[PDB]
Design a protein around this ligand. Structure first.
Ligand SMILES: [Cl-]
Ligand SMILES: [Zn+2]
Length: 257
């Protein structure tokens, strides 16, 4: 199966998922001088006040916090989007060292980690149908840099012990994703794909310009997770990120100048 190792890592994915070499793959490097400021871009509308988190699980490649998406509780609108997009889950990508971990890079700069909040277009009925459409998903990407602790991230950091190995899950209710948002909602946007197989090209990427800070102790906890399942030899879950892909015939737009 695919993974992030020498023998099953990103460079091998194309063999099982040919779309890996597609036209609108992610992530990409964001060249800030080439990004086009687009004054017609509306501001983002993040309505997470009624969000309902359910559980957190280690799926073998990252840990996901899942939300109840049976109704319009936590939605994303505005920006470059048409319609309402429902939050289904968020996960992170991180490195073994503080100088790597994010999937997107800004002017070649890599951040310690990246938080991806995944949303699906409600006009398609369910997540499964949405991934098969060019405008089915909207992923809000937030960079993490090591500095001071993010208070709102601790509840997530403290439960990691319970889901150390692949397949483990824990109840994770009453978690408010609003505590993970930076102060500014300025962003870059471009059409792309999922960064893990099946790598479907159904995503509208919205990358926030402003990163949030987390302490080294907080990121250290992420690094204690395992790719393997219980009773198998230990493989630390680190460097679960895909390298930047060529932009090809796409333009990255900026909501700010
Ligand atoms: Cl990223
Ligand atoms: Zn991701």
């Amino acid at each position: 199966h695919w993974g992030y190792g020498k023998h099953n890592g990103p460079e091998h994915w194309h063999k099982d998922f040919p779309i890996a070499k597609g036209e609108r793959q992610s992530p990409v490097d964001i060249d800030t001088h080439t990004a086009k400021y687009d004054p017609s871009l509306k501001p983002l509308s993040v309505s997470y006040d009624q969000a309902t988190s359910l559980r957190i699980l280690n799926n073998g490649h990252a840990f996901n916090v899942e939300f109840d998406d049976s109704q319009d509780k936590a939605v994303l609108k505005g920006g470059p989007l048409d319609g309402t997009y429902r939050l289904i889950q968020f996960h992170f990508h991180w490195g073994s060292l503080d100088g790597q971990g994010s999937e997107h890079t800004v002017d070649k700069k890599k951040y310690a980690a990246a938080l991806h909040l995944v949303h699906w277009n409600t006009k398609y009925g369910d997540f499964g149908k949405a991934v098969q459409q060019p405008d089915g998903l909207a992923v809000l990407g937030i960079f993490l840099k090591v500095g001071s602790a993010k208070p709102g991230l601790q509840k997530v950091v403290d439960v990691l012990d319970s889901i150390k190995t692949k397949g483990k899950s824990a109840d994770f209710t009453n978690f408010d994703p609003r505590g993970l948002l930076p102060e500014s909602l300025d962003y870059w946007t471009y059409p792309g794909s999922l960064t893990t197989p099946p790598l479907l090209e159904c995503v509208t990427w919205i990358v926030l310009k402003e990163p949030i800070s987390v302490s080294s102790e907080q990121v250290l906890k992420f690094r204690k997770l395992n790719f393997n399942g219980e009773g198998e030899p230990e493989e630390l879950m680190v460097d679960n990120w895909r390298p930047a892909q060529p932009l090809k015939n796409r333009q990255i737009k900026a909501s700010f100048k």
